[PDB]
Design a binder for these strands. Structure first.
Ligand code: MG
Ligand code: MG
Ligand code: MG
Ligand code: MG
Ligand code: MG
Length: 49
RNA sequence: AACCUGGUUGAUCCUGCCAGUUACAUAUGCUUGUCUUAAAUAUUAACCCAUGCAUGUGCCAGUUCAGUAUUGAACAGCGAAACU
């Protein structure tokens, strides 16, 4: 849902899991762009200031 | 260094050039031992060109699910590619 909490977006992002050519075991995650974080809102407040 | 000398006649004083002398550029011939500098395919053909190189660029501050590393379970170090 749109009304939904950002942390629900955080928890639902896909994980990638894979085996390195070296034979190692690793897991990679994407970063969320557009995400509403405290930092965005702070910057906004400061500009209006 | 504000200087001139040789050549017309049988001899002479003139005009006048030629020639010498001087510097400086290219060129060249012979000859070349140190040290300090150092121009350099302008002139002829803005003629023709094999090959190599002479224009690239990343920070903490645009984009990383590359990779690496057993990394704050959204990423967070290092760091391609590729957008910008
Ligand atoms: Mg006469
Ligand atoms: Mg005579
Ligand atoms: Mg003369
Ligand atoms: Mg010596
Ligand atoms: Mg690059």
């Amino acid at each position: 849902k749109k009304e939904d909490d950002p942390i629900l977006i955080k928890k639902s992002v896909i994980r990638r899991t894979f085996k390195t050519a070296k034979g190692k075991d690793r897991t990679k995650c994407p970063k969320i762009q557009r995400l509403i974080t405290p930092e965005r809102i702070l910057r906004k407040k400061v500009y209006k200031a």
